[PDB]
Amino acid sequence: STGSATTTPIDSLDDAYITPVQIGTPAQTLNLDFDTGSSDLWVFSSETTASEVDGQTIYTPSKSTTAKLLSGATWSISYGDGSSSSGDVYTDTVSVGGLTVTGQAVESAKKVSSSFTEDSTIDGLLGLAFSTLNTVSPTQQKTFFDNAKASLDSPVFTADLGYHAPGTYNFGFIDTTAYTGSITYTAVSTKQGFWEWTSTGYAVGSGTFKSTSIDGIADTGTTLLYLPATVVSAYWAQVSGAKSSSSVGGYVFPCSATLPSFTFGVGSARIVIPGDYIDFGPISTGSSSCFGGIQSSAGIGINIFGDVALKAAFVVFNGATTPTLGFASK
């Protein structure tokens, strides 16, 4: 079997992408943020404290004929931005674009941090990293992809994110019409539980390609591209007036500037991020300063190929026994 769902940017900046997911019987549709940087499927629910719910669609397991409390199990997660959520665990039928999984652990949020409360468009997260990162205790749970692998035609899922436009998450097949040329596959290290890989280098605009190993994670759940300070400083030195701001917390540039492209290597292939993708608009309404799409990973400890990088390519997450990441131009 296969699955295919449209993902849509939540705002005019592509801050996040939401995909409709059906949970329970009769189905309850929730718009979840597909995150390849985490492994928990958690949703806002009838158990979440009323003051922390601000317009999200909630999951109500008492109205689902297939819901079962996963007795004793609890979860607790914290993300890279400082946000967090916790609660109890239910099992239910979960379907993504026609692909159905029965007995999927759905983590019901009891408490959510203010960052999630203010994002009314996002009803929860659907983790797509390796199951070793799942926070359900004492019995660690499997992600939706891991549970679905048994039914899929091929143990792959693809991400085809759009620039200020809807995109597609496919499960179990590769759409040869979504990309140009061929797909370049690179090795994945599952050691930290992430889709970790090594980029063969970078170029700034029309400059020469610098062959250097950049280890990082393919993360659909992170908006920006976080790279080593040496790479970031070389990109932003090509934009007049660009500077790292402490009050903002990162590189900013004059909104009047034209940003160069950024190329990253995948084996012998090159993936070009156009300059426009690196522009995140004014820091505040009417501002003359614009927020940059490429930021330093120095304070994070890990390089993250987030949505800015992934949306420039058709990305294959091959979850076979030896996992690989495939990238193609689109």
Which amino acid would we find at residue 297? S
The C-alpha atoms of residue 193 and residue 38 are separated, in whole angstroms, by 9
Picking from 174, 193, 226, the residue at the C-terminal end of a domain is 174
Method: X-ray
Q: Considering its fold, how many domains does the chain have in total?
A: 2
Identify which of 179, 324, 308, 206 has the alpha carbon closest to the alpha carbon of residue 266. Answer: 324
Residues 89 and 189 in one domain: no
Positions marked catalytic: 35, 199
Question: After which residues does the chain become discontinuous at a C–N distance over 2.5 Å?
Answer: none
Domain boundary among 144, 174, 204: 174
Q: In which domain, by residue range, is 280 found? A: 175-330
Q: Provide the Cα torsion 199, 202, 205, 209; round to 10°.
A: -130
**Tokens of residue 314, six digits:** 């058709």
Same domain, 14 and 60: yes
User: Is 151 in the same domain as 231?
Assistant: no
Closest alpha carbon to 278 in 289, 294, 290: 294
* Final resolution, Å: 2.0
Question: Does 254 sit behind a cis peptide bond, omega within 30 degrees of 0 on the bond before it?
Answer: no
- Say if CB 17 and CB 32 are below 8 A apart: no
Residues 118, 122: Cα–Cα separation, whole Å:
9
Strands in 52-205 per DSSP E? 68-78, 84-96, 99-112, 124-127, 156-160, 167-171, 184-187, 196-204
**How far apart, in Å, are the Cα atoms of 159 and each of 67, 165, 236?**
29, 14, 28
Q: Are residues 27 and 158 in the same domain?
A: yes
Cα–Cα distances in Å, from 114 out to 11, 119, 120, 240? 19, 9, 11, 36
CB atoms within 10 A of CB 208: 7
Residues 146 and 200 in one domain: no
Q: Is 165 exposed, middle or buried (0-12, 13-18, 19+ CB in 10 A)?
A: exposed
User: Helical H runs in 62-202?
Assistant: 114-118, 144-148
109 touches 56 (CB < 8 A): no
Single residue among 174, 202, 228 that ends a domain in this structure:
174
Question: Are 144 and 184 within one domain?
Answer: no
Both 319 and 290 in a single domain? yes
Cβ neighbours around 146 below 10 Å, total? 18
